[PDB]
Amino acid sequence: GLEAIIRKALM
Amino acid sequence: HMQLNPESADLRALAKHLYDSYIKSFPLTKAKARAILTGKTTDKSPFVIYDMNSLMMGEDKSKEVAIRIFQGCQFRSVEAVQEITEYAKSIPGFVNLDLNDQVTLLKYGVHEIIYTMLASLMNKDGVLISEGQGFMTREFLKSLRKPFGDFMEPKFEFAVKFNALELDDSDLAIFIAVIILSGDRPGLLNVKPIEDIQDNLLQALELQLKLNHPESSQLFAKLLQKMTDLRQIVTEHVQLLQVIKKTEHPLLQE
């Protein structure tokens, strides 16, 4: 779920 | 002997670029946190939570106190990962890396940066909360029932020693960039270009610390030793979170 937040914030 | 040559001016422009990007990404800086904690600000005085009654009154400005505080802690962490990800995008060369490696660097990095920067909001008494509007005491956190009572204590112990280095925002902006570009995170595809960015960031950090700290000649070495102790803080922290998940965010849901 850490990845979920990171990937979205990188977009 | 140190010279102001083209190479050093580029390290200073890199330091300025990271500072500017740090100020844009993180609403509450150490400079502002320190002015609040020392009562040298014209800005609103934070509400102090020092006991159960001040917490009830303070929730004004889940059933159990310990679990509501743990929930605030968890939601603020989600926000923090977003701010750190936004800062990471500004580090030269970062967005040029394999996206999978950008995600790995931030996944294994954000906890070390969160506790580095939380030290900026801490003194011996407690921690600034809700962007400097509240202050929660170390002893009040410690008073919460097991296993919540010992959750923040290792971050305070780290902060006491970390804050004695007297880093400012200019120092921290480069230090946090060095942490993010760690070539030793598990499951990186392409290590060499991460270490090449880290090398240049280490050079910029060393120069920063020499110009900014005339009274600690080995501050660079001392700061690297801390990146070592942050690893251990994050290990204990992850372990305590596994324990709590086995024993007890709007954006996550979406």
Curated annotation (Swiss-Prot), chain A:
Oligomer status and interactors: Forms a large corepressor complex that contains SIN3A/B and histone deacetylases HDAC1 and HDAC2. This complex associates with the thyroid (TR) and the retinoid acid receptors (RAR) in the absence of ligand, and may stabilize their interaction with TFIIB. Interacts directly with RARA in the absence of ligand; the interaction represses RARA activity. Interacts (isoform SMRT) with HDAC10. Interacts with MINT. Component of the N-Cor repressor complex, at least composed of NCOR1, NCOR2, HDAC3, TBL1X, TBL1R, CORO2A and GPS2. Interacts with CBFA2T3 and ATXN1L.
The listed locations are: Nucleus
* Boundaries of the shown chain within the full protein: 2338 to 2348 of 2514
* Gene, per the UniProt record: NCOR2
Q: Which residue ranges traverse the bilayer?
A: none
Q: What is this protein called?
A: Nuclear receptor corepressor 2
* Function of the protein: Transcriptional corepressor that mediates the transcriptional repression activity of some nuclear receptors by promoting chromatin condensation, thus preventing access of the basal transcription. Acts by recruiting chromatin modifiers, such as histone deacetylases HDAC1, HDAC2 and HDAC3. Required to activate the histone deacetylase activity of HDAC3. Involved in the regulation BCL6-dependent of the germinal center (GC) reactions, mainly through the control of the GC B-cells proliferation and survival.
Q: Motif CORNR box of ID2: which ranges?
A: 2-6
Name the family: Belongs to the N-CoR nuclear receptor corepressors family.
- Where in the body, by tissue, does this protein show up? Ubiquitous. High levels of expression are detected in lung, spleen and brain.
Q: What induces it?
A: Regulated during cell cycle progression.
> What is the organism of origin for this protein?
Homo sapiens
**Domain comment as written in the entry:** The N-terminal region contains repression functions that are divided into three independent repression domains (RD1, RD2 and RD3). The C-terminal region contains the nuclear receptor-interacting domains that are divided in two separate interaction domains (ID1 and ID2). The two interaction domains (ID) contain a conserved sequence referred to as the CORNR box. This motif is required and sufficient to permit binding to unligated TR and RARS. Sequences flanking the CORNR box determine nuclear hormone receptor specificity.
UniProtKB/Swiss-Prot annotation, chain B:
In which tissues or organs does this protein occur?
A: Highest expression in adipose tissue. Lower in skeletal muscle, spleen, heart and liver. Also detectable in placenta, lung and ovary.
What illness does the record link it to?
Answer: Defects in PPARG can lead to type 2 insulin-resistant diabetes and hyptertension. PPARG mutations may be associated with colon cancer. Obesity: A condition characterized by an increase of body weight beyond the limitation of skeletal and physical requirements, as the result of excessive accumulation of body fat.
Region Interaction with FAM120B: start-end pairs: 3-52
Q: What induces it?
A: (Microbial infection) Expression increases when incubated with M.tuberculosis or its lipoprotein LpqH; induction is TLR2-dependent (at protein level).
* Entry's family note: Belongs to the nuclear hormone receptor family. NR1 subfamily.
Q: Which domain of life is it from?
A: Eukaryota
Per the record, the domain comment is: The 9aaTAD motif is a transactivation domain present in a large number of yeast and animal transcription factors.
Q: Fill in the subunit field for this protein.
A: Interacts with FOXO1 (acetylated form). Heterodimer with other nuclear receptors, such as RXRA. The heterodimer with the retinoic acid receptor RXRA is called adipocyte-specific transcription factor ARF6. Interacts with NCOA6 coactivator, leading to a strong increase in transcription of target genes. Interacts with coactivator PPARBP, leading to a mild increase in transcription of target genes. Interacts with NOCA7 in a ligand-inducible manner. Interacts with NCOA1 and NCOA2 LXXLL motifs. Interacts with ASXL1, ASXL2, DNTTIP2, FAM120B, MAP2K1/MEK1, NR0B2, PDPK1, PRDM16, PRMT2 and TGFB1I1.
Localization per Swiss-Prot or TrEMBL: Nucleus; Cytoplasm
- Segment of the intact protein contained: 231 to 499 of 505
At which residues is the cross-link Glycyl lysine isopeptide (Lys-Gly) (interchain with G-Cter in ubiquitin) found?
A: 24
Q: Please name the source species.
A: Homo sapiens (Human)
Q: What is this protein called?
A: Peroxisome proliferator-activated receptor gamma
Q: What's noted about post-translational modification? A: Phosphorylated in basal conditions and dephosphorylated when treated with the ligand. May be dephosphorylated by PPP5C.
**Role of this protein:** Nuclear receptor that binds peroxisome proliferators such as hypolipidemic drugs and fatty acids. Once activated by a ligand, the nuclear receptor binds to DNA specific PPAR response elements (PPRE) and modulates the transcription of its target genes, such as acyl-CoA oxidase. It therefore controls the peroxisomal beta-oxidation pathway of fatty acids. Key regulator of adipocyte differentiation and glucose homeostasis. ARF6 acts as a key regulator of the tissue-specific adipocyte P2 (aP2) enhancer.
- Residue ranges of domain NR LBD in the record: 10-254
Q: In which residues is rosiglitazone bound? A: 74-77, 111, 237
